[PDB]
Ligand binder design. Structure first.
Ligand SMILES: [Co+3]
Ligand SMILES: [Co+3]
Length: 92
């Protein structure tokens, strides 16, 4: 798993990156076929937006989540990714 975190119109801090890494390190223990991962954190007006695309074996998992708080946005994003990963894990 190689994670690339990018920011847009936001002060991307090491805490955000550390937090993102933390969430994905937990995730890989349940889904072990995660190859490349892209994450984009950005702000649209007051909206804090977290985007992610996970490239897994023979498929892609994509989702966005937004919140007034970026860390909460990231947590919501992961919950969406986990749901999709569980479904995709089921198929396989
Ligand atoms: Co997207
Ligand atoms: Co791909």
């Amino acid at each position: 798993m190689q994670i690339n975190i990018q920011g847009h119109h936001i002060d991307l801090t090491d805490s955000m990156q550390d937090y993102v890494h933390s969430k994905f390190d937990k995730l890989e223990r349940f889904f072990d076929h995660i190859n490349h991962v892209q994450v984009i954190l950005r702000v649209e007006k007051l909206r804090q937006i977290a985007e992610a695309t996970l490239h897994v074996n023979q498929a892609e998992i994509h989702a966005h989540a937004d919140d007034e708080n970026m860390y909460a946005a990231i947590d919501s994003l992961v919950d969406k990714l986990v749901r999709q990963l569980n479904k995709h894990k089921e198929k396989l």
